[PDB]
Amino acid sequence: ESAWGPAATIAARQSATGTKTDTPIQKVPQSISVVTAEEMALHQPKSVKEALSYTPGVSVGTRGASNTYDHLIIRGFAAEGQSQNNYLNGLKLQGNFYNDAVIDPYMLERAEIMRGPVSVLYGKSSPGGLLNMVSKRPTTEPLKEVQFKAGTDSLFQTGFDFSDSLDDDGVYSYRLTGLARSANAQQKGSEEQRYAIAPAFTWRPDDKTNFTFLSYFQNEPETGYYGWLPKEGTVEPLPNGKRLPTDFNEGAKNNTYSRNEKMVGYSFDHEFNDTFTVRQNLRFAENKTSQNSVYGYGVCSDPANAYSKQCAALAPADKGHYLARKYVVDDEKLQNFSVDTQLQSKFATGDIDHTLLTGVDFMRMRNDINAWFGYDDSVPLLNLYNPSSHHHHHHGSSVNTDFDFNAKDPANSGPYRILNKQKQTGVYVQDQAQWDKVLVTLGGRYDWADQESLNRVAGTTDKRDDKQFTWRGGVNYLFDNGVTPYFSYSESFEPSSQVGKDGNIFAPSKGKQYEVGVKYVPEDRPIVVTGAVYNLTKTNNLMADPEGSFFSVEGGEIRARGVEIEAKAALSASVNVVGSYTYTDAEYTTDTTYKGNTPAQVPKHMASLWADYTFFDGPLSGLTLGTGGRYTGSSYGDPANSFKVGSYTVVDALVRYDLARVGMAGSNVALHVNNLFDREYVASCFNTYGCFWGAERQVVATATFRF
Numbered sequence: 001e002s003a004w005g006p007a008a009t010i011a012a013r014q015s016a017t018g019t020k021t022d023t024p025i026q027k028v029p030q031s032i033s034v035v036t037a038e039e040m041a042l043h044q045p046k047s048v049k050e051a052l053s054y055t056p057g058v059s060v061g062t063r064g065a066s067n068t069y070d071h072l073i074i075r076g077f078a079a080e081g082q083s084q085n086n087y088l089n090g091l092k093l094q095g096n097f098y099n100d101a102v103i104d105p106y107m108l109e110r111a112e113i114m115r116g117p118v119s120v121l122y123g124k125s126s127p128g129g130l131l132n133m134v135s136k137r138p139t140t141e142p143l144k145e146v147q148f149k150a151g152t153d154s155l156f157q158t159g160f161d162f163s164d165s166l167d168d169d170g171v172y173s174y175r176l177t178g179l180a181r182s183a184n185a186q187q188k189g190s191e192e193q194r195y196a197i198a199p200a201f202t203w204r205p206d207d208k209t210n211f212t213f214l215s216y217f218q219n220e221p222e223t224g225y226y227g228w229l230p231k232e233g234t235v236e237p238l239p240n241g242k243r244l245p246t247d248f249n250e251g252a253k254n255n256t257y258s259r260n261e262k263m264v265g266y267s268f269d270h271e272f273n274d275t276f277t278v279r280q281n282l283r284f285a286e287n288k289t290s291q292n293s294v295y296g297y298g299v300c301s302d303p304a305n306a307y308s309k310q311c312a313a314l315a316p317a318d319k320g321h322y323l324a325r326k327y328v329v330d331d332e333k334l335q336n337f338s339v340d341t342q343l344q345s346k347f348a349t350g351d352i353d354h355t356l357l358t359g360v361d362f363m364r365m366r367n368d369i370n371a372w373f374g375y376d377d378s379v380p381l382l383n384l385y386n387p388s389s390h391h392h393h394h395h396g397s398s399v400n401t402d403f404d405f406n407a408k409d410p411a412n413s414g415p416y417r418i419l420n421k422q423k424q425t426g427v428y429v430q431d432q433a434q435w436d437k438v439l440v441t442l443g444g445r446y447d448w449a450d451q452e453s454l455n456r457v458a459g460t461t462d463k464r465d466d467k468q469f470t471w472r473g474g475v476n477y478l479f480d481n482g483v484t485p486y487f488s489y490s491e492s493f494e495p496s497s498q499v500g501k502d503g504n505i506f507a508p509s510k511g512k513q514y515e516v517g518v519k520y521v522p523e524d525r526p527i528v529v530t531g532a533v534y535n536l537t538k539t540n541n542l543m544a545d546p547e548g549s550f551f552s553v554e555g556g557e558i559r560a561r562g563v564e565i566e567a568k569a570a571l572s573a574s575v576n577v578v579g580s581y582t583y584t585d586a587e588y589t590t591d592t593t594y595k596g597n598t599p600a601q602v603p604k605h606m607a608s609l610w611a612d613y614t615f616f617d618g619p620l621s622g623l624t625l626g627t628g629g630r631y632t633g634s635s636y637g638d639p640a641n642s643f644k645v646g647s648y649t650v651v652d653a654l655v656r657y658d659l660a661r662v663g664m665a666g667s668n669v670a671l672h673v674n675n676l677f678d679r680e681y682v683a684s685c686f687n688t689y690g691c692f693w694g695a696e697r698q699v700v701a702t703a704t705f706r707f
């Protein structure tokens with residue numbers, strides 16, 4: 001098993017996204033989870049976001065049913081500005097504004113999640129939280145796969161995955177992965193369309209050299225729903241005592257959202273001798289996204305719509321059943337270049353063996369944004385009473401009316417045109433010293449984070465250059481019986497793009513995490529079990545100005561302390577299990593407005609458990625039956641902790657059938673169901689006017705043939 005390739009079992013022993021060197025998980029001083037492609041080929045997840053439902057420390061309902069972005073909250077934290085923090089093949093998919101990219105899970109070999117500070121090896125980053133996906137690479141043996149999907153809300157997907165060698169020595173091999181997917185969103189009127197293909201080529205001049213060209217081209221005409229719904233009609237009842245159906249859509253009938261992605265690069269490695277191996281990962285990408293969207297603001301009686309004329313034109317006891325709305329026309333295009341070069345030195349010192357990594361990381365991102373935002377009375381209002389009727393919870397909500405996205409009344413709306421630039425360069429050094437049953441990891445990195453933003457209207461140009469250092473130190477005790485206790489200290493830093501009263505970009509916020517835990521990776525049986533408790537702190541966060549202005553002030557602080565336990569195993573050639581528990585106690589240490597409050601969208605308790613069984617005997621031979629549940633505790637729906645979103649538990653089911661008994665081994669037919677009991681739940685809210693219905697029960701029929 002290679003950290004950059006398949007793991008023959010649900011549970012992987014090798015990972016390289018925590019130390020940037022192929023290392024067995026037990027030997028890693030930090031919480032690292034690894035979702036195998038096998039696991040994904042088990043729930044047929046719609047996204048990488050989805051594929052992380054059973055992984056501890058990660059919330060994945062920050063948007064409920066929506067899959068426009070794989071935006072995750074890890075250990076209670078996320079990138080500033082609703083930005084993702086996702087890496088692909090060791091290089092960050094730096095997005096900006098609405099320009100964040102997503103890779104389809106079918107093109108992945110494994111999706112990994114690293115909890116806690118990650119700058120010691122990757123540069124600027126939100127504290128406690130990083131996602132790194134590993135593209136599929138040409139396989140060791142021929143692979144000719146064709147897959148067919150069909151499901152709820154008109155889901156139709158056809159995809160292939162082929163990989164073979166051009167020569168008999170395997171010096172030249174390739175892999176072409178592609179898919180076409182179409183479906184209707186949960187919300188009436190909205191569609192999802194995706195076309196993507198991943199061309200990959202591997203060149204092995206010998207057994208010490210590997211150059212692998214990795215590319216991904218994806219076009220999404222319609223990405224789907226991305227609106228906001230009031231807590232009134234979702235979490236809480238509307239005046240008429242009723243609620244909005246989970247399929248309710250408060251967007252213009254003519255809402256449109258698209259994204260285009262193109263990227264080419266490579267993962268290279270060469271072994272010079274017995275102590276020096278060089279590896280370099282490079283990628284260049286140009287992604288675009290545009291949109292005509294009418295999203296919903298709070299209900300007319302929401303503090304938000306206080307200054308809304310349209311709202312202040314209704315009988316005082318009616319402002320609470322009418323929905324305020326706004327809009328945004330967007331069109332962006334960014335280019336992203338990234339290259340990481342590193343030298344791995346292997347040498348000894350007495351009874352101490354060393355694995356020294358030293359490398360430089362570089363990236364440049366440029367994103368040109370040209371959008372238009374509607375304000376308080378930018379768009380009509382929507383009455384919630386009628387769409388709240390039984391007839392709609394019965395026969396469904398109704399598509400609304402078009403909207404003039406062209407009309408840009410200088411009154412209710414305004415232009416937003418910005419040119420964002422970003423550059424980061426870092427040099428890091430780490431060593432993995434092993435003194436027999438003692439493994440000590442220590443390393444540090446220095447980053448040169450430069451940014452520059454041009455406001456094509458204010459004609460302003462805000463720039464800031466951050467020089468920052470972060471290091472991490474940890475130790476793991478290799479108990480020959482599998483258990484591997486460990487503890488470590490790490491740091492992260494995240495630049496601000498905002499500017500204070502002094503017309504200057506704020507200084508970066510930081511991450512300081514203290515963590516200890518134990519990892520059980522028995523060498524005999526194929527089972528992994530990790531457990532950890534930690535104390536993560538994000539210092540110098542932005543908070544409301546005491547003087548009360550339109551600007552924010554720094555110095556704020558938030559602490560996140562909790563416990564995460566996870567288990568993945570192959571308790572049999574017929575039994576498989578995955579489960580985890582998460583305890584997250586995130587709280588505002590220092591803050592003008594929310595001291596002592598817990599950040600929205602992060603539940604205090606989370607747990608999941610999944611198990612599947614396969615038959616090899618009797619008339620049920622080649623039959624797999626699996627099921628599991630995901631628990632999401634209650635959480636707060638706003639910074640003020642005004643109201644709360646209630647907990648919920650969703651059950652998943654699986655029935656797979658090996659198609660061997662028809663002259664087709666390796667091929668199979670399966671039925672996947674998510675939210676078996678079609679439970680109705682508000683996934684979360686980030687504010688009183690921003691709530692998202694969870695996903696309704698979904699059924700998918702899959703037929704994946706292996707030729």
Ligand SMILES: CCCCCCCCCC[N+](C)(C)[O-]
Nearest residue numbers: 579580581605607608609633
């Ligand atoms: C596989 C581990 C399952 C553990 C589930 C624990 C549920 C804790 C619920 C917390 N509670 C709502 C009761 O406060």
Ligand SMILES: CCCCCCCCCC[N+](C)(C)[O-]
Nearest residue numbers: 607608609629630631647649
């Ligand atoms: C997949 C694990 C299932 C855990 C379910 C835990 C439910 C706890 C309910 C406690 N309650 C909310 C009623 O106080």
